[PDB]
Amino acid sequence: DKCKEREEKIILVSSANEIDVRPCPLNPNEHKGTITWYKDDSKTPVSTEQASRIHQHKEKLWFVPAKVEDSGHYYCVVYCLRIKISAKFVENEPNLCYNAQAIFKQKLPVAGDGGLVCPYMEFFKNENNELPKLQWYKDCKPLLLDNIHFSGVKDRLIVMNVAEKHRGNYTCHASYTYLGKQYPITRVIEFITLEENKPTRPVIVSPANETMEVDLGSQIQLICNVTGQLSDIAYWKWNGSVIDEDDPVLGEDYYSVENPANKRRSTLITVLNISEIESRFYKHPFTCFAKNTHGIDAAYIQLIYP
Amino acid sequence: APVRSLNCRIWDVNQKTFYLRNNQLVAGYLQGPNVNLEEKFSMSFVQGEESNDKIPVALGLKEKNLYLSCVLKDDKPTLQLESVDPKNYPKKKMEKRFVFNKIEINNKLEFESAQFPNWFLCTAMEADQPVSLTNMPDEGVMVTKFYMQFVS
Numbered sequence A: 001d002k003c004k005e006r007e008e009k010i011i012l013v014s015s016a017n018e019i020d021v022r023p024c025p026l027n028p029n030e031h032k033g034t035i036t037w038y039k040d041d042s043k044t045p046v047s048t049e050q051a052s053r054i055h056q057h058k059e060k061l062w063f064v065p066a067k068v069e070d071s072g073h074y075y076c077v078v079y080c081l082r083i084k085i086s087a088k089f090v091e092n093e094p095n096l097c098y099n100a101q102a103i104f105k106q107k108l109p110v111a112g113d114g115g116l117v118c119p120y121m122e123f124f125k126n127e128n129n130e131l132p133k134l135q136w137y138k139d140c141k142p143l144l145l146d147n148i149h150f151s152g153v154k155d156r157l158i159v160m161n162v163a164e165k166h167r168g169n170y171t172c173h174a175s176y177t178y179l180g181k182q183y184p185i186t187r188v189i190e191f192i193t194l195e196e197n198k199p200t201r202p203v204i205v206s207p208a209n210e211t212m213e214v215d216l217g218s219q220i221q222l223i224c225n226v227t228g229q230l231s232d233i234a235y236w237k238w239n240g241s242v243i244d245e246d247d248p249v250l251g252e253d254y255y256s257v258e259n260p261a262n263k264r265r266s267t268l269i270t271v272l273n274i275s276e277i278e279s280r281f282y283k284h285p286f287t288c289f290a291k292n293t294h295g296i297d298a299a300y301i302q303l304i305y306p
Numbered sequence B: 001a002p003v004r005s006l007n008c009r010i011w012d013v014n015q016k017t018f019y020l021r022n023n024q025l026v027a028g029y030l031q032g033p034n035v036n037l038e039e040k041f042s043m044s045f046v047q048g049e050e051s052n053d054k055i056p057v058a059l060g061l062k063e064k065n066l067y068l069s070c071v072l073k074d075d076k077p078t079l080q081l082e083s084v085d086p087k088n089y090p091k092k093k094m095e096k097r098f099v100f101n102k103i104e105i106n107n108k109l110e111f112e113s114a115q116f117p118n119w120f121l122c123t124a125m126e127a128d129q130p131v132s133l134t135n136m137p138d139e140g141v142m143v144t145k146f147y148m149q150f151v152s
């Protein structure tokens, strides 16, 4: 009936001389049965004997510990599925406690409390379901987890009051027991900080609470010009309602331009198209709103008869 | 455009990023050349609740015409990707399945299903599992907070 074949696109780079585990990567959906593992192009399954350096246990593939020479492809055969998996094992760079190829990039905005996370710790839990305690380093120098500047909880490091100087390469170290023997585990994370997501209000440049004489039955467009961030929103209302999108006579077009000079003083232009001036439009103002998480500005144009 | 639409990157507060496996959105950790697998989003400002707390948005996969959407599956609110016709999408009045109420507190974002109030966009504690929805964001079962960075 023919085995299906998939080739996995994530290549996970791990440390030589560290324990590692790989699960066969099905989506829930493509589960269901006996999972055998094979090395390279063998059609003879891996060792099931946990004493052996590379072996199958609980349908996972274990390197105890891994070696650079293990780098290569492996198959897990889960009707049939057979997935080619490629893995890479790398020595630390000289005089370093990690290898840049194993870096997981992570990022937090400045000025908050935020977390780094030591990845792929899932499978190192001890019954009753706890992770071994992690030690954390930045550029290969120990961090004090004093719950004032840093905290270590489970797989996370809480960096308190994230600032620019926190940038650097962080390692998380654990020691895991497997068959009564202890094995080291590290992951490395390149920590990048982003500019302060900083609380300001949009400025409505135009309209500016003014009247405008217009002829009944004719057509006009009104421009709402807002100085702000690209992320702010600028939109029109009339008589307490957003401009309905199936409205047969009112329509909005939204345009924007990034200010290279100052990302915080970009422009939004929302054009309201009044395809026919109806007599009702003379009773209430058209109000442009400019909105983001910290506040609202509003300014209007009131149509009047000439 | 008839809808204000912004390119961004979105990652959860466990530093997981999104990618496609089969045809599903999953969340995990990528290294080296694999960062290529990361999906960016087009975030549109659609119509819905008029509030100082929430902004209704739809979330599309940048350039793939795949939209995040909340649908009942076996009597349970489920996040599914939906192929849309580029000819009609994105638009201001997105159907309610595509609508999320974006809530931002302290540089972190939650996305509440418009269709399913009290249900939030979330990822699992473990890497490489599908993105999902949950109505228990206050227990640390699932991750329901996200950061975003606008890339246009």
Ligand SMILES: *[C@@H]1O[C@H](CO)[C@@H](O)[C@H](O)[C@H]1NC(C)=O
Binding pocket: A100, A167, A168, A169, A190, A191, A192
């Ligand atoms: C982390 O290490 C890599 C290579 O050693 C280097 O390119 C990078 O500049 C470092 N990053 C930071 C943020 O210190």
Ligand SMILES: *[C@@H]1O[C@H](CO)[C@@H](O)[C@H](O)[C@H]1NC(C)=O
Binding pocket: A205, A206, A223, A225, A226, A267, A269
């Ligand atoms: C929007 O306002 C700013 C005023 O600073 C100006 O540079 C730009 O010309 C205005 N554009 C329109 C189309 O009103």
Ligand SMILES: *[C@@H]1O[C@H](CO)[C@@H](O)[C@H](O)[C@H]1NC(C)=O
Binding pocket: A239, A280, A281, A283, A284
């Ligand atoms: C404004 O909308 C209200 C509420 O739906 C409606 O009753 C009223 O007719 C509108 N005012 C005008 C001038 O159309």
Ligand SMILES: *[C@@H]1O[C@H](CO)[C@@H](O)[C@H](O)[C@H]1NC(C)=O
Binding pocket: A208, A209, A298, A299, A300
């Ligand atoms: C312009 O009009 C709006 C809407 O009534 C009002 O909120 C705002 O304060 C006015 N601005 C000025 C400078 O008068």
Ligand code: NA
Binding pocket: A014, A015, A018, A102, A185, A186, A187, A188
């Ligand atoms: Na490591």
